[PDB]
């Protein structure tokens, strides 16, 4: 599924994301926009370390969750990749939940740290309701 912009900000609204430990609902937008276009079924293999992005949020299988090729791994969000992949995200909001508990917080993605950190992302959730 791809999801419309304010379709997507409604829908995390809904899952409780708004300011979830102090990450508003922009950041949130801002980051699924640059991790995958709002698209659920998105994923990205790493030749480099054998790992692959899951997702809207491209959750990494290294450590969220488990896809079974991936070398030395954990599944914290103790999920199958596979629920990474649906058109419902409630499980994928789960598991980024789960990944923002941690230290780092939204930095936990990089992509987040280049595209949203220090900017102004009003503009993502802008006349959605939300």
Not at 42 to 62: E, H, L, P, V
Request: aromatic share 10%; glycine share 8%; with cysteine.
């Amino acid at each position: 599924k791809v999801f419309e912009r304010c379709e997507l900000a409604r829908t995390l609204k809904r899952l409780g994301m708004d300011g979830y430990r102090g990450i508003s609902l922009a950041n949130w937008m801002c980051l699924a926009k640059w991790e995958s276009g709002y698209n659920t079924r998105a994923t990205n293999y790493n030749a480099g370390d054998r790992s692959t992005d899951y997702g809207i949020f491209q959750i990494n299988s290294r450590y969220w969750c488990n896809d079974g090729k991936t070398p030395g791994a954990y599944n914290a969000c103790h999920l199958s990749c596979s629920a990474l992949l649906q058109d419902n995200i409630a499980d994928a909001v789960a598991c980024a939940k789960r990944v923002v508990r941690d230290p780092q917080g939204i930095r936990a993605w990089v992509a987040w740290r280049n595209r949203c950190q220090n900017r102004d992302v009003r503009q993502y959730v802008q006349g959605c309701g939300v």
